[PDB]
């Protein structure tokens, strides 16, 4: 048939890439708005403060 | 201090002359005639023939009325007539030196499947052996380098699971029949 | 054999021992001076850093500019010259870079029309010159 590309190694990773992006995109869908993580306190200043 | 074997040996030998016209011509004639694959198999046949000839020469060096020479010569001669390279008429220790490569290569499984009368060509015989069709005495053998003996000569037949000897049809036949039934129903 | 007697064995053994010592190929491998003077130190391959790209010239019959490189060793710091083997590979080697250096194949002797070289370059920057020649690997940066 003539639907896909010529070789296999330049298309077999596209299924893995689409699986990764749909897995992460669904991971951006079902999210909880309460009981989140811990933030970062980020301390800056001058010498000898 | 582990429990292994570490015992192995090379079964072939590389010739001293890498480029000789007559040697390459003879080796390629043997490969084409007896359906070989490469030069390592005819080299290993040459190596085991050289080992047998060297053992026969070392046995023939010693004098007669020796129990070691008589026992080893009788064992070697009985094994060679059991394999099928000699007969009962030439039952002598000094007749071993007249044996050649084609006497060993005649006893190969591929040649015997070809010449027994169930394969078209020798390459077709090797292909039929390698795809698990030919069995000897209810044992499926899928390798062409199986040195048959004289007592197991008349038991070469297709396997019970092969379509050639009576069995289930293969993958192409079943798929084509399914396509025909789908198109006609 | 000259001393041919029944109980003459230590004379024959000592004479053959001194005449075996009085050789060149056996004496080269049984004295530590040849191994210590060898920059490889009895090793097959060696590593080194490129100092500069030099150009040496061929001998009397044929005339060309055989392009080499001055490399100082890792293990001892001896300073040798090494011939870049194939065509156009002098772009692949820059100064202060790691190279893997092997011999020509004549056991520490000059090969061909190049005077004074005994070594050749196999790899540069831990990647082979054959892959760089055939467009199979790229130099990392």
């Amino acid at each position: 048939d003539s639907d896909d590309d010529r070789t296999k190694e330049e298309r077999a990773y596209d299924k893995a890439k689409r699986r990764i992006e749909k897995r992460r995109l669904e991971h951006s869908k079902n999210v909880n708005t309460e009981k989140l993580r811990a933030p970062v306190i980020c301390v800056l200043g001058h010498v000898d403060t | 201090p582990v429990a292994r074997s570490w015992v192995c040996r090379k079964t072939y030998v590389t010739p001293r002359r890498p480029f000789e016209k007559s040697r390459l011509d003879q080796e390629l004639k043997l490969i084409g005639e007896y359906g070989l694959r490469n030069k390592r198999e005819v080299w290993r046949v040459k190596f085991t023939l050289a080992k047998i000839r060297k053992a026969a020469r070392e046995l023939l060096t010693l004098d007669e009325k020796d129990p070691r020479r008589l026992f080893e010569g009788n064992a070697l001669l009985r094994r060679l007539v059991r394999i099928g390279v000699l007969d009962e008429g030439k039952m002598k220790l000094d007749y071993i030196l007249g044996l050649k490569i084609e006497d060993f290569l005649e006893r190969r499984l591929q040649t015997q499947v070809f010449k027994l009368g169930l394969a078209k060509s020798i390459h077709h015989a090797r292909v039929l052996i390698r795809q698990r069709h030919i069995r000897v005495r209810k044992q499926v053998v899928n390798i062409p380098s199986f040195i048959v003996r004289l007592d197991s000569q008349k038991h070469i037949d297709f396997s019970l699971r092969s379509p050639y000897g009576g069995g289930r049809p293969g993958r192409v036949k079943r798929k084509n029949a399914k396509k025909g039934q789908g198109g006609a129903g | 054999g000259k001393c041919r007697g029944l109980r003459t064995a230590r004379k024959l053994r000592s004479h053959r021992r001194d005449q075996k010592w009085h050789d060149k190929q056996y004496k080269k491998a049984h004295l530590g001076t040849a191994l210590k003077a060898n920059p490889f130190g009895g090793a097959s391959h060696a590593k080194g850093i490129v100092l500069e790209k030099v150009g040496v010239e061929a001998k009397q019959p044929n005339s060309a500019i055989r392009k080499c490189v001055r490399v100082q060793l890792i293990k001892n710091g001896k300073k040798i010259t090494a011939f870049v083997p194939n065509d156009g590979c002098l772009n692949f080697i820059e100064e202060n870079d790691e190279v893997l250096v092997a011999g020509f194949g004549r056991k520490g002797h000059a090969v061909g029309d190049i005077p004074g070289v005994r070594f050749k370059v196999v790899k540069v920057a831990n990647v082979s010159l054959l892959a760089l020649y055939k467009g199979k690997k790229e130099r990392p940066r």
């Binding site: - | 390629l28 004639k29 084409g32 694959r37 390459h123 | 156009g88």
Partner: protein, 57 residues
């Protein structure tokens, strides 16, 4: 010209000729079968000198 010490000049100024789409050469056992056929089957009784397998006269 440019210079006498130009590295890799003949590799860099030669013309680029692309590859050709050729049939897959069979490798393994049947290659020896083809070699045996072409050497010791299709031989013709000739005279004088036998030409080589790459004799493109």
């Amino acid at each position: 010209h440019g210079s006498l010490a130009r590295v890799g000049k003949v590799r860099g100024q030669t013309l680029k000729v692309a590859k050709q789409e050729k049939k897959k050469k069979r490798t393994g056992r049947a290659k020896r079968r083809m070699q045996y056929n072409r050497r010791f089957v299709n031989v013709v009784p000739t005279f004088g000198k036998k030409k080589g397998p790459n004799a493109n006269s």
